[PDB]
């Protein structure tokens, strides 16, 4: 009878690094598709299962809800099917992914004068991750470092300004 | 997570002065190291920092081209160096760092002792 | 380049006493702020960051607070040991600032 904490999540201040990216477990509660939906905040809001329009907690065993910060252009690349450096080594979803990714432009909160290099990627992996696999070791190869960072910066074009990245998984099983 | 600096120091204008900060306990290998220094009962003035993965450093204008930070993966040490003192450059040297698990850079979670530097002639 | 002005540079409170500094920015940093305490010939200690964020065992009554531009360190009871001076820091801008300090003194 007690409310699903998507604000903790959307809201979060900080936000994972892609190579390290969040998930959080959403269970029993309710909360609802329609109110981002109409939030209009979103510039990336595309779905794979259905449309949001449920507008209960209506036929739901649980909810992952995964998030993190990559680049712009590299938003297209959270999609089943892609095979970029974040879907090849950082974050690939299932290619009969069911859910929706939800993205939208943090020029303005992860962006620093300076540049923010707390963000960073996985640039190479000697095999690809299969779906939602995640590797987060930091080995130094030999003698050569396997992450990078973006260094965001507000005057960098929006094809390189952070984006911030919800996916929202869906568990029928019970 | 302790950090242990080097004494203190005292040399003459113009030469240059090299603080080391052995830093023990850290469970990562990758982690942020500042420094920040306090002249005399004064504010406490950031002048940059290095990763302790690839060794990337990030000076602040203020010094550039004046200090240089190395970093010594073996034996888990961080050290700094200014040249060319200007004897405005009398403070504390503190190195301080973070973020442990998730990398920042932004704040200071653990300090080492403070090392105490005087310029003059 | 980034300033910060903290409000009361100096402060005379009791044990007991709720006592609340301020830290105002030149500009907006949305909450990318951290809180120190720093207590004669010791090196400073992490209080709060991004302006709310209890650092680990650091006693629940102090509380950071605000955004934007203007932000605030609450202690909701003062204990002897939290007589020290007190700074802020921006983590916005690049080279990261410091505000002047808040001396915090015993009331007398």
């Known amino acids: 009878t007690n409310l699903c904490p998507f604000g903790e999540v959307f809201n979060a201040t900080r936000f994972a690094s892609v190579y390290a990216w969040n998930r959080k477990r959403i269970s029993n509660c309710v909360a609802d598709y329609s109110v981002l939906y109409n939030s209009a905040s979103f510039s990336t809001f595309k779905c794979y299962g259905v449309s949001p329009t449920k507008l209960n907690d209506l036929c739901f065993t649980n909810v992952y809800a995964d998030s993190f910060v990559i680049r712009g252009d590299e938003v297209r690349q959270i999609a089943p099917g892609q095979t970029g450096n974040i879907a090849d080594y950082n974050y690939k979803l299932p290619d009969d992914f069911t859910g929706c990714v939800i993205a939208w432009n943090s020029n303005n909160l992860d962006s620093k004068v300076g540049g923010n290099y707390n963000y960073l990627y996985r640039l190479f992996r000697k095999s690809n991750l299969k779906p939602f696999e995640r590797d987060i070791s930091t080995e130094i190869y030999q003698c050569y470092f396997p992450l990078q960072s973006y260094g965001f910066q507000p005057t960098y074009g929006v094809g390189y300004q952070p984006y911030r990245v919800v996916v929202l998984s869906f568990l029928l099983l019970h | 997570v302790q950090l242990v600096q080097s004494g203190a120091e005292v040399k003459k204008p113009g030469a240059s002065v090299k603080v080391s900060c052995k830093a023990s306990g850290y469970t990562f290998t990758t982690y942020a190291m500042h420094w920040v220094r306090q002249a005399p009962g004064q504010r406490l003035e950031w002048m940059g920092w290095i990763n302790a993965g690839n060794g990337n450093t990030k000076y602040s204008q203020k010094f550039q081209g004046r200090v240089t930070i190395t970093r010594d993966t073996s034996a888990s040490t961080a050290y700094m160096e200014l040249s060319s003192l200007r004897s405005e450059d009398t403070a504390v040297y503190y190195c301080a760092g973070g973020g442990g698990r998730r990398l920042q850079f932004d704040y200071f979670d653990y300090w080492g002792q403070g090392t105490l530097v005087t310029v003059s002639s | 380049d980034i300033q910060m002005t903290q409000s009361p540079s100096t402060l005379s409170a009791s044990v007991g006493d709720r006592v609340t500094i301020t830290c105002r920015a030149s500009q907006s940093i949305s909450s990318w702020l951290a809180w120190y305490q720093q207590k004669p010939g010791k090196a400073p200690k992490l209080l709060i960051y991004?302006?709310?964020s209890l650092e680990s065992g650091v006693p629940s009554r102090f509380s950071g607070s605000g955004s934007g531009t203007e932000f605030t360190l609450t202690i909701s009871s003062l204990q002897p040991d939290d007589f020290a001076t007190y700074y802020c820091q921006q983590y916005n801008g690049y080279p990261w600032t410091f505000g002047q300090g808040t001396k915090v003194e015993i009331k007398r």
């Open positions: 991004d302006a709310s």
